[PDB]
Ligand binder design. Structure first.
Ligand code: A1BGB
Ligand code: A1BGB
Ligand code: A1BGB
Ligand code: A1BGB
Ligand code: A1BGB
Lengths: 79, 79, 79, 79, 79, 86, 86, 86, 86, 86
């Protein structure tokens, strides 16, 4: 047997109130906040890559080799 | 046997109130907020890539190799 | 046997109120909010890619290799 | 047997209130906040990569070798 | 047997209130805050990489060798 | 006097505002005002006797959540002679 | 006098504002005002006797959450002769 | 007098503001005002006797959370003759 | 007199402000005002007798959290003759 | 007189401000004002007798957390004849 990333909960009682709960989070992006007030942005681009926004990426993969979650704002000229 | 990313909950009682719950989150993007107030943006682009918006990407894959979740704002000229 | 991303819940009682629930989230984009107030945007584009909007992408795939969830604002000139 | 990243909780009682809970977090990005007020940004780009935004990437992978979670703002010209 | 990164909790009682909880955090980025007020930024880029934003990357991998979590603001010209 | 001008351009925006007053705004926010959450009570053998004569009595397992804007929130009020003139 | 000008450009923005007053804003925030969370009570054999004559009594397991803006929040108030003139 | 100008440019921004007053803002923040969290009580054999005559009594397991803006928050108030003139 | 100018540039920003007043702002912050957290009480055999005549009594396990802005926060107040003239 | 200028550049920023007043700001900070944390009480056999006549009594296990801005925070106040003229 093999357990990986397993949340387990068990409870037992006779009389009363019993609560059992389990939660799991894998590759989760939570709570991203961004505020821009009275911001001046001047961009001149000639053949390049410019990123000024908000990017939130969450990736979960099984048996995946060589995977890329995020690739933001790049110039690639491989030969 | 093999368990991966498994949420398990068990409860037992005789008299009363019993609550059992299980939750699972894999590759989940939650709670993204963005505010732009009185913002000035001037962009001049000639053959490039400019990104100024909001991007939220969530990807879950099984047996997937070489997968890319997000690729934002790039210039690719591979030969 | 093999379990992956499985939410399990079990409950037992004799007299009273019993609640059993299970939830699963895979590749889910939840809660994206964006506000733009009194925002000035001037864009001049000549043969390029400009992105200023809101993008929310959720992808779930099984046995998929080389899959791309989102590709936003790019210039591709592969030979 | 083998346990890795496992959260386990067990409780037992006869009369009263009993609460059992388990939580797991793997590759989770939580609580990112950014504020820009009265900020001036002037960017001139010629064939390069400029990144000025907010990037939040969370990646969880199993049996994945050579994986890259985030690659932001780079110029690649491999031969 | 082998245990690695395992949180375990057990409780027993007869009468009263009993609470049992377990939490696990692996590769988690939590609580990142950034404020820029009245900031002036002037950038001139010619074929390089400039990064001025906020980057938060969290990666959890199992059986993954040679993995890179974050690679921000680099110029690569390998032959 | 508030003046905004833009002349001899390709793309031009000119905005002029005399007086401006912003308002309250919520974006992806959660609020909880007067909320009762997660109350558990277990009783086996309770003997309760109440003898009330012209009064307010609150007895037993009580869970009250109140949210008032322009009024008063009370649970038990045994008063008398409440008058408002003009 | 507030003047903003922009002449002989390709992209130009000119904004002029006399008086400005910002407001309150929430972005991805959580608030809890008057919140009761996680109350557990266990009682086996409780004997309770109440004799109330013209008063306010609060008895037993009580969980009260109150949020008031322009009023008073009370649990037990045994008063008399409340008057507001004009 | 507030003047902002920008002439003979390619990209130009000119903003002029006479008076400005910022406001309160929350970004990814949590607030707790008047919050009761995690109260556990165990009682086996409690004998309680209350004899109230024209008063306010609060008895037993009580959990009260109050948040008031322009009012008073009280638990037990046994007063009399409350008057507001004009 | 406040003047800001920018001439003969490629990218130019000119901002002029007469009077400015910043506000309060929270970024990724937590606040706790009037919070009761983690109260545990165990009682086996408690005998309690209360005889109240025109007063305020608070008895037993009590957990009170209060947050007031423009008012008074009291637990037990046995007063009389409260008047506000004009 | 406040003047800021920038001439004959490639990238130029000119800002002029007459009067400026900064505000309070929190970044990744935690605050605790009037907080009760971690109170444990164990009682086996307690005998309590209270005889109150026109007064305020607080009895037993009490946990009070108060946060007031423009008011008074009291636990037990047995007063009389409170008047505010004009
Ligand atoms: C809660 C409670 C219980 C028993 C004894 C008392 C004194 C209180 N407290 C209050 O009534 C506080 N109050 N007073 C007034 C003014 C007023 C009160 C009574 C009669 C005439 C005028 C009021 C007016 C408009 C909207 C709200 C309110 C408010 O909330
Ligand atoms: C809570 C309580 C219980 C028993 C005894 C007392 C004194 C109090 N405290 C208060 O009533 C505080 N108060 N007073 C006034 C003014 C007022 C009160 C009574 C009658 C006429 C005017 C008031 C007016 C408008 C909105 C709120 C309020 C408020 O909240
Ligand atoms: C809590 C309590 C219990 C019993 C005895 C007392 C004195 C107090 N304390 C207060 O009532 C404090 N107070 N007073 C006033 C003024 C006022 C009070 C009574 C009658 C007429 C005017 C008030 C007005 C408007 C909104 C709030 C308030 C407030 O909060
Ligand atoms: C808490 C308490 C219990 C019993 C005895 C006392 C003296 C106190 N203390 C206070 O009432 C303090 N106070 N006073 C006043 C002024 C005022 C009070 C009573 C009647 C008329 C005016 C007040 C006005 C507006 C908002 C708050 C308040 C406040 O908070
Ligand atoms: C706590 C307490 C208990 C019993 C006896 C006393 C003296 C105190 N102390 C105070 O009331 C302190 N105080 N006083 C005043 C002024 C004032 C008080 C009563 C009546 C009329 C005016 C006040 C006004 C507005 C907001 C707060 C306050 C405040 O807090």
């Amino acid at each position: 047997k093999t357990k990986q990333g397993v949340a387990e909960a068990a409870g037992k009682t006779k009389e009363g109130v019993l609560y059992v709960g389990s939660k799991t989070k894998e590759g989760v992006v939570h709570g991203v906040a961004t505020v821009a007030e009275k911001t001046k942005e001047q961009v001149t681009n000639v053949g390049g890559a410019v990123v000024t926004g908000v990017t939130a990426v969450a990736q979960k993969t099984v048996e995946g080799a060589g995977s890329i979650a995020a690739a933001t704002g790049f110039v690639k000229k491989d030969q």
